[PDB]
Design a protein around this nucleic acid. Structure first.
Ligand SMILES: COc1cccc2c1C(=O)c1c(O)c3c(c(O)c1C2=O)C[C@@](O)(C(=O)CO)C[C@@H]3O[C@H]1C[C@H](N)[C@H](O)[C@H](C)O1
Ligand SMILES: [Cl-]
Ligand SMILES: [Mn+2]
Ligand SMILES: [Mn+2]
Ligand SMILES: [Mn+2]
Length: 10
DNA sequence: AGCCGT
DNA sequence: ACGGCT
């Protein structure tokens, strides 16, 4: 996720 | 640590 | 079949 906590996605 | 869609 | 950052 994020970043942080990419995306998702990307 | 933290999920999704080319 | 298989990748994206702080
Ligand atoms: C052992 O790999 C996996 C095993 C189980 C599920 C997964 C994957 C997986 O590798 C995977 C991905 O690599 C990707 C995604 C994904 O959901 C998974 C799994 O679910 C989603 C993503 O497609 C998008 O966000 C499109 O916008 C990008 C990424 O795709 C990669 C490869 C694609 N061919 C394309 O080049 C895309 C741009 O990046
Ligand atoms: Cl790439
Ligand atoms: Mn990990
Ligand atoms: Mn899927
Ligand atoms: Mn992977």
């Amino acid at each position: 996720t994020x970043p942080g906590v990419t995306x998702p996605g990307v």
